[PDB]
Design an enzyme around this catalytic site. Structure first.
Site, PDB file in Angstrom:
ATOM      1  N   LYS A   7       0.811  -1.185   0.000  1.00  0.00           N
ATOM      2  CA  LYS A   7       0.000   0.000   0.000  1.00  0.00           C
ATOM      3  C   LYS A   7       0.854   1.248   0.000  1.00  0.00           C
ATOM      4  CE  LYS A   7      -3.063   2.387   3.150  1.00  0.00           C
ATOM      5  NZ  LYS A   7      -4.207   2.142   4.088  1.00  0.00           N
ATOM      6  N   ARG A  10       2.127   1.748  -3.553  1.00  0.00           N
ATOM      7  CA  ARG A  10       1.089   2.208  -4.429  1.00  0.00           C
ATOM      8  C   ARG A  10       0.732   3.670  -4.173  1.00  0.00           C
ATOM      9  NH1 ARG A  10      -4.378   2.363  -3.627  1.00  0.00           N
ATOM     10  NH2 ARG A  10      -4.273   0.886  -1.886  1.00  0.00           N
ATOM     11  N   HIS A  12       2.600   6.045  -2.568  1.00  0.00           N
ATOM     12  CA  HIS A  12       3.651   7.033  -2.399  1.00  0.00           C
ATOM     13  C   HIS A  12       4.838   6.917  -3.328  1.00  0.00           C
ATOM     14  CE1 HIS A  12       1.577   8.585   1.034  1.00  0.00           C
ATOM     15  NE2 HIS A  12       1.620   7.377   1.618  1.00  0.00           N
ATOM     16  N   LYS A  41      -9.089  11.575  -1.596  1.00  0.00           N
ATOM     17  CA  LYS A  41      -8.097  11.662  -0.546  1.00  0.00           C
ATOM     18  C   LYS A  41      -7.607  13.092  -0.534  1.00  0.00           C
ATOM     19  CE  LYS A  41      -3.589   9.846   0.881  1.00  0.00           C
ATOM     20  NZ  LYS A  41      -2.676   8.766   1.315  1.00  0.00           N
ATOM     21  N   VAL A  43      -4.917  14.908   0.677  1.00  0.00           N
ATOM     22  CA  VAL A  43      -3.518  15.196   0.538  1.00  0.00           C
ATOM     23  C   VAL A  43      -2.784  13.900   0.270  1.00  0.00           C
ATOM     24  CG1 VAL A  43      -3.658  17.026   2.273  1.00  0.00           C
ATOM     25  CG2 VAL A  43      -2.836  14.704   2.900  1.00  0.00           C
ATOM     26  N   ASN A  44      -1.722  13.950  -0.500  1.00  0.00           N
ATOM     27  CA  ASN A  44      -0.863  12.789  -0.692  1.00  0.00           C
ATOM     28  C   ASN A  44       0.481  13.257  -1.214  1.00  0.00           C
ATOM     29  OD1 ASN A  44      -0.612   9.884  -0.667  1.00  0.00           O
ATOM     30  ND2 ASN A  44      -0.320  10.060  -2.818  1.00  0.00           N
ATOM     31  N   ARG A  85      -2.563  18.222  -3.289  1.00  0.00           N
ATOM     32  CA  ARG A  85      -3.533  18.751  -2.330  1.00  0.00           C
ATOM     33  C   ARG A  85      -4.806  19.106  -3.085  1.00  0.00           C
ATOM     34  NH1 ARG A  85       0.086  19.982   2.040  1.00  0.00           N
ATOM     35  NH2 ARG A  85       0.929  21.232   0.309  1.00  0.00           N
ATOM     36  N   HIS A 119       4.020   3.927   6.265  1.00  0.00           N
ATOM     37  CA  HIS A 119       3.255   5.142   6.378  1.00  0.00           C
ATOM     38  C   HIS A 119       4.149   6.313   6.054  1.00  0.00           C
ATOM     39  CE1 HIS A 119       1.110   8.356   8.547  1.00  0.00           C
ATOM     40  NE2 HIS A 119       2.222   8.512   9.262  1.00  0.00           N
ATOM     41  N   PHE A 120       3.635   7.275   5.313  1.00  0.00           N
ATOM     42  CA  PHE A 120       4.322   8.527   5.050  1.00  0.00           C
ATOM     43  C   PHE A 120       3.860   9.550   6.053  1.00  0.00           C
ATOM     44  CE2 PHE A 120       6.939  10.937   2.096  1.00  0.00           C
ATOM     45  CZ  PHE A 120       6.597  12.205   2.474  1.00  0.00           C
ATOM     46  N   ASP A 121       4.762  10.037   6.900  1.00  0.00           N
ATOM     47  CA  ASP A 121       4.375  10.908   7.976  1.00  0.00           C
ATOM     48  C   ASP A 121       4.455  12.388   7.612  1.00  0.00           C
ATOM     49  OD1 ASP A 121       3.347  10.646  10.720  1.00  0.00           O
ATOM     50  OD2 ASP A 121       5.071  11.798  11.291  1.00  0.00           O
TER      51      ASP A 121
END
Length: 124
Positions: A7, A10, A12, A41, A43-44, A85, A119-121
């Site tokens: 995940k 996919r 990030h 979503k 923000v990414n 964004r 996880h992207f923090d």
């Protein structure tokens, strides 16, 4: 199901381009990576580096995550990133994003064996 590590890839990773090349990058990538299937979503971040270089961050500087957990790691180097964004005109299912290209350090949370990003923090 999809693993947390998969995940993360996919959501990030974009090793196929060195940077966003147009204002449409986020619109296209958010859709193609299935990030808009159920909702927009908001923000990414996409990272334009090799997977191995991102996975290596789990061996770099240990820091607190934004929520206080202590399994976060900050990259020693800056990386090429694209922030996506949602814009004011976004309206599901026609989700719309502003694309911003930058070079920043990344902060990821790592888990597992092998110990990999899940996880992207943040970017700093």
């Amino acid at each position: 199901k999809e693993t947390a590590a998969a995940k993360f890839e996919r959501q990030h990773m974009d090793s196929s381009t060195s940077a966003a090349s147009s204002s449409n990058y986020c619109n296209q990538m958010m859709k193609s990576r299935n990030l808009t299937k159920d909702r927009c979503k908001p923000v990414n971040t996409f990272v334009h580096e090799s997977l191995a270089d991102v996975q290596a961050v789990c061996s770099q500087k240990n820091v607190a995550c934004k929520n206080g957990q202590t399994n976060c790691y900050q990259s020693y180097s800056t990386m090429s990133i694209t922030d996506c964004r949602e814009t004011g005109s976004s309206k599901y299912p026609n989700c719309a994003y502003k694309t911003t290209q930058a070079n920043k350090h990344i902060i990821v949370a790592c888990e597992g064996n092998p110990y990999v990003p899940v996880h992207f923090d943040a970017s700093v």
